[model samples]
Target: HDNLVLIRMKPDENGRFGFNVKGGYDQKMPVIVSRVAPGTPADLCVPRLNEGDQVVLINGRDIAEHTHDQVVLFIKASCERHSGELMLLVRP
Candidate 1:
């Protein structure tokens, strides 16, 4: 499926992008959404960032080639870099 969706999620008071994102080192499977925070910007996503939703990009940057640790760091940094306005591209 060529289906894709992008969302501009604002961070919560705790600097969370409002979504619990995680990835795999398998390389074949990219990072996916494990959880979504309610009453946050993520809850308003168009495609609705579900638990199994694949996160193809963070802040408009793809981390498909990065390692697990690398992606984690980037995601954390991205939360701060985007100033709560992070861009999330997902394959749901």
Candidate 2:
């Protein structure tokens, strides 16, 4: 099954964000997704991902082998390729 999740940065906290599920076919792990500006193209595609959805990948690369910091870096680099909202797929 697939799901659409939305996430927003947290207030009053550095690098803090919130997650919300917009739509999904199944229930799965909850993950917060965010990207670094001027770094990755993800922001160009999926600027806002539902907070409730699971992050399956990053920049066409599998996220399983990456750590939290690494993932952030990946996003920063990916967002550099594009300037506008980007496209991302989520699953549950």
Candidate 3:
């Protein structure tokens, strides 16, 4: 069975989601959650996103084939356009 996890988060007024990501096509690895800041939205998620999680989707769009830079841009644009709301699908 696949262990896909979906997470939705609202950034702070300053649009800080409190997480960092690493690993992308350029790195020859899946988009990964590298850190979840100690007391932030990501750390407070219901399911809790953690380091090492593979990010598969951003705001409902499949990013499985997207490159690192593409994913970064996608996330930035989506966050900006969506009122700082972020939805991510990941595999833990």
Candidate 4:
């Protein structure tokens, strides 16, 4: 009645860590925000995000209804309207 999960470790040239899920539901996979650069629009807005925080909404939109690709598109579009700060909600 107990479930066990296996993860593999893969390291890139920069020595950053990553995980490979051996067997699990697709939804159980980790959601990652890639290509984050320093001083970028998103970086400037939400600068103190740590692991295990769930980004539930952005710019008054419910991100749970959107796929990962759609969320990226939304971020890109919203970045165009970046007046000062971008608001985000995180559940820790």
Candidate 5:
């Protein structure tokens, strides 16, 4: 079973969250942290999203079954739109 947690971070001055994600295990939408940039919003999180951490939800939506593009839309675009921050429930 995967543990649940909310990782929230505000975008940088340039609105660059400075991280990247990709599909995990069979190219599915359990998002994996592909990168974490130094001194970025992602790197400063109290509960960090390490590389290979699987994202299970976004804003309460179970996104484990979503497509790669779908997860990206939720994390990279949609997240910032709501509350001006990135929020995700992930399994590390």
Candidate 6:
């Protein structure tokens, strides 16, 4: 599908976003949601995050072109800088 989804997730007290992602430069693919933990923000959001969803951006930054490690770094930085809030732009 061409439409994109916006998911605003607030991390838990421990600063965990509660989802896992895969695919990146090494995998030669766009970063996709690999796992979403039960009862976490990701699962509780308006439009629930699920496996196979492509992560296009985090906050307002472009990360679809980043490597796996770079994506991780960006996510970590966003979590810290945004006070553990992740506004994700994704494709389902």
lDDT of 3 by residue, 1-92 (tens): 17899887887777678988887777788888988989898999798888999898888778767788988887777544455568888999
Candidate 6 per-residue C-alpha lDDT over 1-92 given as tens digits, one digit per residue, 9 for 90 to 100: 36999888787788787889888977798898989989988899888888888988877778856899988887777544455578888989
Error of 1 at 37 (Å): 3.5
Residue-level error in angstroms, candidate 2, position 57: 1.5
Q: Model 4: what TM-score?
A: 0.46
- Candidate number achieving the greatest TM-score relative to the actual structure: 6
Greater TM-score among 3 and 5 belongs to 3
Candidate 3: the clashing residue pairs are none
**Global lDDT of model 6:** 0.81
lDDT of 1: 0.71
Model 6 quality (TM-score): 0.86
Q: Between which residue pairs do clashes occur in model 4? A: none
Instruction: Output the lDDT of residue 85, model 3.
Output: 69
| lDDT accuracy of residue 38 in candidate 6 | 93
Q: Put down candidate 1 lDDT per residue, 22-90, tens digits, no spaces.
A: 666655567878888787667875656777888777677777787767767776775455655677677
Measured against the true structure, the TM-scores of the candidates, in listed sequence, are 0.73, 0.42, 0.85, 0.46, 0.79, 0.86
The list of candidate 1 runs beyond 4 A from truth reads 26-28, 45-47, 78-84
CA RMSD per model (angstroms): 2.8, 9.3, 2.1, 11.9, 2.6, 2.0
Q: In candidate 3, which residue ranges exceed 4 Å CA deviation?
A: 79-84
> What are the per-residue Cα lDDT tens digits for candidate 2 across 1-92?
24544322222223322232221212222334433344223232344443234666543555554566655565446343233222234553
TM-score of 1: 0.73
lDDT for each residue of candidate 5 in 1-92, tens digit (9 for 90 to 100): 45766788887777777788888435744577889888888888888767777777776677756777777677667534557767778777
